[PDB]
Design a protein around this ligand. Structure first.
Ligand code: MG
Ligand code: MG
Ligand code: MG
Ligand code: MG
Ligand code: ZN
Lengths: 83, 83, 129, 135, 102, 220, 24, 71, 221
RNA sequence: AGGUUCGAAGACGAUCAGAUACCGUCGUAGUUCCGACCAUAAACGAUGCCGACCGGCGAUGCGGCGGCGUUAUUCCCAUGACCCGCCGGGCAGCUUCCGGGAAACCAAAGUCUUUGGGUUCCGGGGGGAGUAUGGUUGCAAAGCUGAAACUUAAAGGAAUUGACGG
């Protein structure tokens, strides 16, 4: 995209897996996008905003979507370090 | 597991790994102080001794070489050397 | 026997990258391997890497960033001049927009864009895109 | 022998049970009379064959659930099955059989040293696998 | 079309296996290929176990057993219905058939 | 006269989804053919590739069915390939058109060099496979046209690829595998990772959770 | 024809040809 | 696998011209046996004298008498 | 659950130990190895209760992130678990699938049981292999329960656990329902939940006919 | 040299329309050993060797290193028999949407149009034909090397459905 004139010549920009950085193709029906609802400090209730992750089909098929999600949440503070 | 920390493996699996397949090679063998009975001096015996080491002053044999490690005779006290 | 340490390094990187792993370990380390990793990392196709020093030929741990399609090698290091560097670009690179051919020149190991810029040829090492 | 009901009579019997449950009852003759107007059946033989299987089904469902479904039958049977309501929970045991390894895990968690818990003698012998090969 | 991964015989690290003779036709069959059925038969049939025990002078005698190990070529095994053809997926199951003892 | 059975179809019908690329972004499978003709209206040109009469040997000699291959897509960056085997030729044609509509993918276009106007060629050389047929698309300079066999030529023209070299290997006479290999190569133009796509992706809401308030009242 | 017996027949023909050439 | 060494050009070239003898077109165009056996002797056309007129039966599926001449 | 309010309680530790969640099987899966703490001399793998609490909270935050409570669907094909998932959906407003999961529920739109969920929950990956497989056709993220030998092929938020024990399963569903309700606006984080965990326990039909009459005999005496 | 058994050839007896066979009874060469030849097998994993990398699981053989315990004897350890693991080299096995392939299938037959680790042998539609001729080896049987004329539109591989089966 983005020829030298500056305009974005592309009809859409595909997502990428947040675990393996691969392009999630339009026909990848094994790929998912999930949301984790982060809570507030004082009462631990859902506060409206959440956190988004995407897993491609191949990672979610070899069996390591679980570990990848856990690492992403650990990096983003959803899961404490003492895990 | 995709995100195994190769650079910093914990000591237990490094000890479990083969000596050449460790991240940095480390011999499993070691040198040890061996006190033969009825003497005063301390002689050094390789933990994987291939020859019959002889306590010089005291007549009895120290270690019988076997397959992997030396076979210390009964009553022979041994101490490690700086791990 | 092992007759090309750079070939084994690049094939190991390719297999771990296809597998999706975050890191890869290369057992034989060389100056050519380190330079090749440096030009890849400067262009951004890999991350930081470590050289584990044993008193033998050391090892390398490379941080894969998940944006390397292919990192093959050209084992017979052919003499590529500037008049026929274009043919190698068409034969190896996936497009004229991106992709790089690494060839060792007398001014050091460098990509083909830089080799053309300073007007020098040499022996072709490999490619990555 | 030979009294197996066709899928035609069976499915028709199920369907009228689905839609018309209160209108129907345990009596065969009453069920065949309501079958006259809740559905049209060109055959009298099919009419009382369907009605016969309806009474058989409704007799079964009077004391359990079958592959037929009633929306009421779902809701009141979920309102029922409240609980056995034991006076106390089954998980509030005064003493819990805890392995020494488990207590080591608990103190790593820092939730060890609970007076409710008591350690047990670890098993000795380490022979847990079945003898490999046939017998 | 390789029908079986093991080529119908239990030979993996060997070069050659000494043969045997089929106990039905005396076919030379490799030992690792032949069907071995080791039978434990009663000496006396189940219909005459009573007559032998009644006529035995001993107050408590145990009738012996014939221990014969039988070696079959696959043609005599199939003809005698010891082994049967199976499906493509069924051929991969190596568990012995159930005894149906109860 | 179109009552959608899926949640996605309901959102398309009531003007909640404004683009087909919105569905492509979240990779939601398309299960209704009437979903996409709302977006690509009267722009999908239909061509029948082949009617092959497959036969099944029975006691009655043989029974005959007809397998129809259909290539569809507006000449702007969307292409679809559908295969349908049916007893009647007409029914196989309609079924193949529906399947081709459902399996429509976006086509990525790039430049051979010196990006000036609109993209015309494939972004990079790609390879599709089906059976033994290996079809490789290769970027071409502006004006060269599409050099290929007739079957991938019409597939690529519908895709909107103005310029392309192709190389084919295998039993290209098998029209089904030859068209599937070309379609596979066209599909994976977006799946190919490129430096301009290296930028980290910002995540938006999926149409399901963006219009879940609307789905409870309409598509109950 | 079985290939082994075709081979055997071929050996007979070769031996006949060698006989005739030796005769000359 | 094929040798890719930088100094293997002799073996690559020798293997190519050795293996080229294994396809029919190269063998017939360079051995000269086909040229000798050709009645035309490598000529597109050739003149002759009609010895007699002959008829030849067609192959098995067809049934006709093709009209030929011995020349 | 990295916060103090989202910290495991001593009473929750007691419930876990009583149910048997910490106990596992004799076989270890290489992708479940991270959750395993240590293997005892019996061979039963022991499960880190801190780690299952974190995965339980992670699944809870995932579930409450969906505005439509009925978008999530809970599936259990095994008798140890129909009652748990049925009561789970009754409390959390979810959609239960008790018993056999018919194939084509997610892929085939013709049948009347066809539905379009946004989240899938599984009691056993081995037992509920079919709904997990169909989740890979329809862009369906899955929370699934676990075992020391469970296959994690299409599993994302596998909570370490003992899915074989009836008491462990009921407690697992109970704390999952309790946590999603608690971080939603239904429970005020302070008092214990009025729902007793045994409500989700599946009791066998071997005693379902004799416990109620023995209870009546005890009540009259 | 020795020849027990078995057994090419051969004979007879069966069987069959015929039966130079399959079945039975004999039975030569051989089968056995020593020496000298021959160099061929579906000599098969119909699958080059060396090297690197890329899943999981349970076993098994060898060696080594650890550890609850039971057992052997004696007075303790080793040390053997088991039990629970780890490492390396092997024969393999199960499973997997790693990937490949025409598929059968293969953790190699993977890492291949994203095509290059090193290096041998070797194939080029089917027949003619492993034939003719030349050379060479051999006591011979034969082995190694090895065409052409001519002829032909298919020959083949894997899977699918049917039909048929003593
Ligand atoms: Mg052999
Ligand atoms: Mg005899
Ligand atoms: Mg080589
Ligand atoms: Mg040929
Ligand atoms: Zn036999």
């Amino acid at each position: 995209m983005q020829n030298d004139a500056g305009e974005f010549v592309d009809l859409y920009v595909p997502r990428k897996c947040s675990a393996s950085n691969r392009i999630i193709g339009a026909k990848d029906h094994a790929s998912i996008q999930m949301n984790v609802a982060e809570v507030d400090k004082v009462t631990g209730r859902f506060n409206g905003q959440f956190k988004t992750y995407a897993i491609c089909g191949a990672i979610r098929r070899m069996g390591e979507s679980d570990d990848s999600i856990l690492r992403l949440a650990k990096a983003d503070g959803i899961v404490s370090k003492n895990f | 597991p995709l995100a195994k920390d190769l650079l910093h493996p914990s000591p237990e699996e490094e000890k479990r790994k083969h000596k050449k397949k460790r991240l940095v090679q480390s011999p499993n063998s070691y040198f040890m102080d061996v006190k033969c009975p009825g003497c005063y001096k301390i002689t050094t015996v390789f933990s994987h001794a291939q020859t019959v080491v002889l306590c010089v002053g005291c007549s009895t044999v120290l270690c019988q070489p076997t397959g992997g490690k030396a076979r210390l005779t009964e009553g022979c006290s041994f101490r490690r050397k700086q791990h | 026997v092992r007759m090309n340490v750079l070939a084994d390094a690049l094939k190991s990187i390719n297999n771990a990258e296809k597998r999706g792993k975050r890191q890869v370990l290369i057992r034989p380390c060389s100056k050519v391997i380190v330079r090749f990793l440096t030009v890849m990392m400067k262009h951004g196709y890999i991350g930081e890497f470590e050289i584990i020093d044993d008193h033998r030929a050391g090892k390398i741990v490379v941080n894969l960033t998940g944006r390397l399609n292919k990192c093959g090698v050209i084992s017979p290091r052919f003499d590529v001049q500037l008049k026929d560097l274009e043919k190698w670009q068409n034969n190896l690179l996936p497009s004229r927009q991106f992709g790089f051919i690494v060839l060792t020149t007398s001014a050091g190991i460098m990509d083909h864009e830089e080799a053309r810029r300073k007007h020098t040829g040499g022996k072709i090492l490999g490619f990555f895109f | 022998m030979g009294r197996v009901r066709t899928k035609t009579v069976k499915k028709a019997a199920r369907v009228i049970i689905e839609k018309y449950y209160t209108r129907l009852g345990n009596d065969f003759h009453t069920n065949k009379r309501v079958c006259e107007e809740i559905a049209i059946i060109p055959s009298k033989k099919l009419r009382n064959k369907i009605a016969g299987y309806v009474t058989h089904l409704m007799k079964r469902i009077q004391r359990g659930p079958v592959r037929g479904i009633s929306i009421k039958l779902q809701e009141e049977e979920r309102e029922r099955r409240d609980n056995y309501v034991p006076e106390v929970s089954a998980l509030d045991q005064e003493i819990i059989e805890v392995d020494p390894d488990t207590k080591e895990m608990l103190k790593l968690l820092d939730f060890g040293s609970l007076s409710n818990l008591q350690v047990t003698q670890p098993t000795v012998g380490m022979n847990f696998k079945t003898p490999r090969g046939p017998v | 079309t390789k029908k079986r991964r093991n080529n119908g015989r239990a030979k993996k690290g060997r070069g050659h296996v000494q043969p045997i003779r089929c106990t039905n036709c005396a076919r030379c069959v490799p030992k690792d290929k032949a069907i071995k059925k080791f039978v434990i038969r009663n000496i006396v049939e189940a219909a005459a176990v009573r007559d032998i025990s009644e006529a035995s002078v001993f107050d408590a005698y145990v009738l012996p057993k014939l221990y014969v190990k039988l070696h079959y070529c696959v043609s005599c095994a199939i003809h005698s219905k010891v082994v049967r053809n199976r499906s493509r997926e069924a051929r991969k199951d190596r568990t012995p058939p159930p005894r149906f003892r109860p | 006269e179109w009552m959608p059975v899926t949640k996605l179809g309901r959102l398309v019908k009531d003007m909640k989804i404004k683009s087909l690329e919105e569905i492509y972004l979240f990779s939601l499978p398309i299960k209704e053919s009437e979903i996409i003709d709302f977006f690509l209206g009267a722009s999908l040109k239909d061509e029948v590739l082949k009617i092959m009469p497959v036969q099944k040997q029975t006691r009655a000699g043989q029974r005959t069915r007809f397998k129809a291959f259909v290539a569809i897509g507006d000449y702007n960056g969307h292409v679809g390939l559908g295969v349908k085997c049916s007893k009647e030729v007409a029914t196989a044609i309609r079924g193949a058109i529906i399947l081709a509509k459902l399996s429509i993918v976006p086509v990525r276009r790039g430049y051979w060099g010196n990006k000036i106007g609109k993209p015309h060629t494939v972004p990079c050389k790609v390879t599709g496979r089906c059976g033994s047929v290996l079809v490789r698309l290769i970027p071409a300079p502006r004006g060269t046209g599409i050099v290929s066999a007739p079957v991938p030529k019409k597939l690529l023209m519908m895709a909107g690829i103005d310029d392309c070299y192709t190389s084919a290997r295998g039993c290209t006479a098998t029209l089904g595998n030859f068209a599937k290999a070309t379609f596979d190569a066209i599909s994976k133009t977006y799946s190919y990772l490129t430096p301009d796509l290296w930028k980290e992706t910002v995540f938006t809401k999926s149409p399901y959770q963006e219009f879940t308030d609307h789905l409870v009242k309409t598509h109950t | 024809m079985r290939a082994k017996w075709r081979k055997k027949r071929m050996r007979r023909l070769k031996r006949k040809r060698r006989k005739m050439r030796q005769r000359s | 696998g094929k040798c890719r060494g930088l100094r293997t050009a002799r073996k690559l070239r020798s293997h190519r011209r050795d293996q080229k003898w294994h396809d029919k077109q190269y063998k017939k165009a360079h051995l000269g046996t086909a040229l000798k056996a050709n009645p035309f002797g490598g000529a597109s056309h050739a003149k002759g004298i009609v010895l007699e007129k002959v008829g030849v039966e067609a192959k098995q599926p067809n049934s006709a008498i093709r009209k030929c001449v011995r020349v | 659950g990295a916060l103090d309010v989202l910290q495991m309680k001593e009473e929750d530790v007691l419930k876990f130990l009583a149910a048997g969640t910490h106990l596992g099987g004799t076989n270890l899966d290489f992708q479940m190895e991270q959750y395993i703490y240590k293997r005892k001399s019996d061979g039963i793998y022991i499960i880190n209760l801190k780690r299952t609490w974190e995965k339980l909270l992670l699944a809870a935050r995932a579930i409450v992130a969906i505005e439509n409570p009925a978008d999530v669907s809970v599936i259990s094909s095994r008798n140890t678990g129909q009652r748990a998932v049925l009561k789970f959906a009754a409390a959390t407003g979810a959609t239960p699938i008790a018993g056999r999961f018919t194939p084509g529920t997610f892929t085939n739109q013709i049948q009347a049981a066809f539905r379009e969920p946004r989240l899938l929950v599984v009691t056993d990956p081995r037992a509920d292999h079919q709904p997990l497989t169909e989740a890979s056709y329809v862009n369906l993220p899955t929370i699934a329960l676990c075992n020391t030998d469970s296959p994690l092929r299409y599993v994302d938020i596998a909570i370490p656990c003992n899915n074989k024990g009836a008491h462990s399963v009921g407690l697992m569903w109970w704390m999952l329902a309790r946590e999603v309700l608690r971080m939603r606006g239904t429970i005020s984080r302070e008092h214990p939940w009025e729902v007793m965990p045994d409500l989700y326990f599946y009791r066998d039909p071997e005693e379902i006919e004799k416990e109620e009459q023995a209870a009546a005999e005890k009540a009259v005496t």
